[PDB]
Design an enzyme around this catalytic site. Structure first.
Site, PDB file in Angstrom:
ATOM      1  N   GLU A  63       0.820  -1.209   0.000  1.00 37.84           N
ATOM      2  CA  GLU A  63       0.000   0.000   0.000  1.00 37.84           C
ATOM      3  C   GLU A  63       0.854   1.259   0.000  1.00 37.84           C
ATOM      4  O   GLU A  63       0.357   2.327  -0.370  1.00 37.84           O
ATOM      5  CB  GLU A  63      -0.978   0.068   1.175  1.00 37.84           C
ATOM      6  CG  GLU A  63      -0.369   0.192   2.544  1.00 37.84           C
ATOM      7  CD  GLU A  63      -1.416   0.193   3.628  1.00 37.84           C
ATOM      8  OE1 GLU A  63      -2.609   0.072   3.286  1.00 37.84           O
ATOM      9  OE2 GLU A  63      -1.058   0.329   4.816  1.00 37.84           O
ATOM     10  N   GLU A  82       9.217   5.519   9.214  1.00 34.73           N
ATOM     11  CA  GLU A  82       7.836   5.702   9.647  1.00 34.73           C
ATOM     12  C   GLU A  82       7.500   4.797  10.832  1.00 34.73           C
ATOM     13  O   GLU A  82       6.741   5.189  11.724  1.00 34.73           O
ATOM     14  CB  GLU A  82       6.898   5.461   8.465  1.00 34.73           C
ATOM     15  CG  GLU A  82       5.433   5.697   8.745  1.00 34.73           C
ATOM     16  CD  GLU A  82       4.580   5.492   7.513  1.00 34.73           C
ATOM     17  OE1 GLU A  82       5.145   5.147   6.455  1.00 34.73           O
ATOM     18  OE2 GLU A  82       3.349   5.674   7.599  1.00 34.73           O
TER      19      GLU A  82
END
Lengths: 420, 445, 78
Positions: B59, B136
């Site tokens: 994704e 992240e």
């Protein structure tokens, strides 16, 4: 089934807008032109305590009764405040909407303001200000407004630190008696008929005076506040005066905002059509985020550039964004980019009015600002009426205007206003 | 204009099935905008600990270039029309959804048909997104509730694929290759596990024609005929605690095993959660809050915040409470929380049940507002229940709940059960598992 | 006259900070004390921003909107 938005101005100036969409969830708001801009330098932070005082004792319903009844019917009560106006919204199902209607009208029109309650609530003032100031762009926007205006828009939305422990009940009573008057309020209902809303309006909202206090016209100063706090990210905002609400040029400014980038359209995207992101990203190998900031108030405007960058590369990011806006101001733009910016603005408006909360916020803002309900098709028509030469004029007005700068972080490499 | 016929007035979700087996469902409104999404029955529960970051990394890679729209072109004509593109992955579902105008409805659909079908996974883009995902996860390390809920899953579902996170461990992020991503796509992006959902200004026949033109003739056949199955996940009564005294606040989650998606008892359990409710330090109610836990937390200055959760997976789940508070209050908070649970097991009265029913009704009707949560609910409903449950059915299932069956369901899922405990921060005054387990029952009952 | 005490007459103790490492025999005038300053509230830490991809969207674009609720957490939009 939402056949018509039906609209009535009473002779005392109170606006009533209602729409029976036969939704299972009724939402009723009262919009008062009593924002933080109506305080002078003697009662700063009074609007913040008034916003936090929505669950106090009223002459007709106690605080225990209000909280227990609202949570017993399952509805909720919210207060939304900008610098210009405040909104008191109550939310519930249709079968017990009326108990929420006396609760909302009792809170908005008849506060008791007992002094022990506000003495207990000033600690909540401190906690709420800390939670709001937990993230840096709130403090940047506060410092930017304090830079930009001398008065009547530079008053903070949150209470100052010295005013905590000093706001009294008679100051709140004075603010309510001078600003919560009948000619500055709009009662907006989604899921209710016009008859019920107008009869609670004539049974509650007839005891107030008139237009209330005027204001102070929000004159402009400009300048700079730099807050050295040693953050890893430098937040900077450079703004100039722009058009107000109701001016056509402000619409052009909105288009100019979507010409420069008003937010991402892809979760983890590169912002390919954002002119500021394209101009900054070619010279940066470290994270940044640049956007166009637009703020229109009933007598004033503020258009500018917001940058978040590293401490060592704040100057080149700020200079690249400013040079991009200067290149826009010299007639270097594509008509396809203007069409894409118009499509972005139209999609953003239609997505903002998509939910019932955003719809009722739009209706209340329109009823307070203009006294009428403007259809979204007419809004899109006047968006499409904007010329690209108007966008060039707006960018030239930003470039030639006097600047206002609010910065925070490690500002050892952040440039000054004369260094741009 | 009563509540019952108002819930009857909600439009019916119309569902059709293509030849390859993918569902197409739409709900029509009078909005000028629309939300069109693709929901795939794939997540971290379907991974076998060698491709644990695969769905997350796909994704990340889905919007960075396809075969017919290479590089940054897909960005250019998703945002030339003002559309918004979003994607997310849970442990069981993946969603790619677009918010757009109604008149841009065809192109958006083929944009979705360009994303889940013809993705081009370039190697330098793989390196860039590997670095992006590593930092992240470094960002996500400093959010304590995500860490606590990941710890809760890891200690509640030990030895099962439900313990692992959606992002996976960092070593898998360092060594995922392109071949493993293509294998993940060719194993899990199958047509009978895909729902094309749409909400708002969408004509269902137009959406069906566009799905026939764009989403047909995809997948439907396992190439080696290796059909995967979803094994049940064992719940383990256990505790994990990560003590780190330099953190300013402590986060503690305590959960028990939920029943799963298909069990109707969730509705009753949701009413139970509505009796306990949530609280944050910025709440305006104060001491007069109807929840006894929130009122005693205000009165004794116990917690920064608390909330109740009912997370459901395929015949399993976590039902419990998460609170953040300072160290010196932690044990006391646990005590009051457990007391509320035992009250719901033993002494639930009709007034708090009626309040919880009203809260649940308002919560679900307020959640179904706007095109995006309606399309989101349609996608989850056809992925989990196999159908879209109408809102009048939800109201009937709420109104059939009284105090007696609330006591029975709370006793069956709460009383004398071994919980899963996750703690992070200054958790020295967090009690032992033996003390918590003793607090999960009453000697007076 | 090349000193701040000789050239700035009244503004000598405000352009200069004088501390004592070891106290002298004579006590200084205006001893002073700190009257128990209040403690700021303890808040949970927010996540940092270490990539451009999560920084995207953090810049403000709209006027400040504050919202409080009876049983809804307070929020702010930009």
């Amino acid at each position: 089934q939402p056949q018509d938005l039906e609209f009535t101005k009473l002779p005392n100036g109170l606006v009533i807008a209602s729409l029976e969409n036969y939704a299972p969830l009724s939402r009723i708001g009262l919009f008062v032109k009593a924002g933080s801009r109506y305080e002078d330098s003697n009662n700063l932070g009074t609007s913040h305590l008034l916003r936090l005082a929505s669950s106090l004792t009223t002459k007709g319903a106690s605080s225990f009764k209000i909280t227990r009844g609202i949570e017993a019917v399952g509805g909720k009560l919210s207060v939304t405040a900008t610098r210009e106006n405040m909104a008191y919204t109550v939310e519930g199902i249709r079968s017990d909407i009326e108990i929420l209607m006396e609760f909302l009208l009792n809170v908005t029109t008849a506060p008791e303001f007992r002094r022990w309650e506000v003495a207990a609530l000033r600690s909540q003032l401190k906690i709420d200000k800390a939670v709001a100031f937990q993230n840096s762009q709130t403090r940047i926007i506060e410092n930017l407004h304090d830079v930009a205006y001398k008065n009547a828009l530079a008053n903070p939305l949150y209470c100052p630190d010295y005013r905590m422990g000093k706001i009294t009940s008679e100051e709140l009573h004075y603010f309510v008696q001078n600003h919560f008057t009948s000619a500055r309020m709009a009662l907006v209902g989604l899921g209710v008929s016009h008859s019920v809303l107008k009869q609670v309006a004539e049974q509650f909202l007839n005891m107030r005076g008139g237009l209330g206090l005027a204001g102070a016209k929000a004159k402009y100063r400009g300048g700079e506040i730099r807050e050295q706090n040693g953050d890893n990210l430098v937040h900077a905002a450079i703004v100039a005066e722009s058009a107000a609400i109701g001016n056509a040029e402000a619409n052009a400014f909105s288009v100019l905002q979507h010409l420069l980038g008003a937010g991402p359209h892809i979760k983890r995207g590169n912002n390919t059509t954002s002119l500021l992101s394209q101009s900054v990203a070619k010279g940066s190998h470290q994270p940044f985020d640049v956007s166009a900031f637009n703020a229109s108030y009933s007598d004033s405007g503020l258009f500018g550039i917001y940058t978040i960058s590293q401490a060592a590369a704040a100057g080149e990011v700020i200079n690249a964004a400013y040079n991009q806006v200067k290149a826009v101001a010299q007639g270097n733009l594509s008509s396809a980019d203007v069409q894409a910016a118009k499509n972005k603005l139209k999609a953003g408006y239609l997505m903002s009015v998509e939910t019932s909360e955003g719809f009722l916020s739009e209706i209340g803002s329109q009823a307070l600002a203009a006294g009428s309900y403007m259809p979204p098709s007419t809004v899109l028509q006047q968006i499409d009426s904007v010329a690209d030469a108007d966008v060039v004029k707006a960018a030239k007005k930003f470039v030639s205007g006097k600047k206002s700068m609010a910065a925070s972080g490690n500002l050892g490499h952040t440039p000054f206003l004369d260094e741009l | 204009a009563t509540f019952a016929q108002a819930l009857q007035s909600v439009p019916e979700t119309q569902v059709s099935i293509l030849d390859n087996g993918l569902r197409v469902a739409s709900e029509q409104s009078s909005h000028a905008t629309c939300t069109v999404g693709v929901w795939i029955d794939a997540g971290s529960r379907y991974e076998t600990e060698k491709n644990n970051g695969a769905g997350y990394f796909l994704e990340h890679l889905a919007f960075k270039g396809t075969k017919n729209r290479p590089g940054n072109a897909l960005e250019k004509e998703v945002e030339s029309i003002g559309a918004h593109l979003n994607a997310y992955s849970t442990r069981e579902h993946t969603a790619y959804l677009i918010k757009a105008l109604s008149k841009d409805l065809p192109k958006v659909v083929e944009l979705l048909a360009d994303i889940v079908q013809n993705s081009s996974l370039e190697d330098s883009q793989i390196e860039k997104e590997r670095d992006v995902i590593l930092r992240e996860m470094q960002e996500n390390d400093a959010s304590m509730q995500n860490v606590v809920f990941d710890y809760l899953h890891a200690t509640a579902f030990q030895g099962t694929p439900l313990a692992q996170a959606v992002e996976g461990p960092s070593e898998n992020v360092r060594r995922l290759s392109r071949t493993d991503l293509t294998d993940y796509l060719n194993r899990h992006y199958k047509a009978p596990r895909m729902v094309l959902a749409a909400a708002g200004g969408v004509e269902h026949q137009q959406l069906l024609d566009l799905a026939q033109k764009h989403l047909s003739s995809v997948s439907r056949v396992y190439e080696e005929d290796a059909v995967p199955g979803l094994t049940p996940c064992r719940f383990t009564g256990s505790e994990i605690r990560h003590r780190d005294d330099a953190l300013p606040l402590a986060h503690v989650a305590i959960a028990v095993e939920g029943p799963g998606w298909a069990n109707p008892d969730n509705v009753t359990l949701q009413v139970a959660n509505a009796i306990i409710g949530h609280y944050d330090c910025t709440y305006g109610g104060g001491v007069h809050l109807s929840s006894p836990l929130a009122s005693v937390a205000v009165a004794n200055k116990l917690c920064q915040s608390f909330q109740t959760f009912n997370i459901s997976y395929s015949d399993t789940g976590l039902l419990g409470a998460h609170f953040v508070c300072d160290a010196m209050s932690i044990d006391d908070m646990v005590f009051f929380l457990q007391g509320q649970w035992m009250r719901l097991c033993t002494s639930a009265t009709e007034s708090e049940v009626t309040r919880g029913k009203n809260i649940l009704r308002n919560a679900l009707v307020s959640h179904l507002d706007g095109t995006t949560p309606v399309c989101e609910d349609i996608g989850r409903s056809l992925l989990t229940y196999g159908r879209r449950i109408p809102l009048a059915e939800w109201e009937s299932r709420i109104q059939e709940v009284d105090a007696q069956m609330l006591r029975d369901i709370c006793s069956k899922y709460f009383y004398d059960q071994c919980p899963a405990v996750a703690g992070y921060g200054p958790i020295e005054q967090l009690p032992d598992y033996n003390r918590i387990r003793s607090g999960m029952f009453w000697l007076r009952f | 006259m090349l000193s701040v005490a000789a050239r700035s007459g009244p503004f000598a103790p405000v352009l200069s900070a004088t501390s004592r490492g070891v106290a002298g025999a004579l006590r200084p005038l205006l001893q002073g004390a700190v009257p128990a300053a209040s403690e700021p509230p303890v808040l949970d830490v927010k996540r940092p921003f270490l990539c451009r991809e999560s920084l995207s969207g953090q810049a403000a674009a709209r006027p400040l909107v504050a919202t409080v609720g009876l049983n809804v957490p307070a929020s702010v939009r930009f």
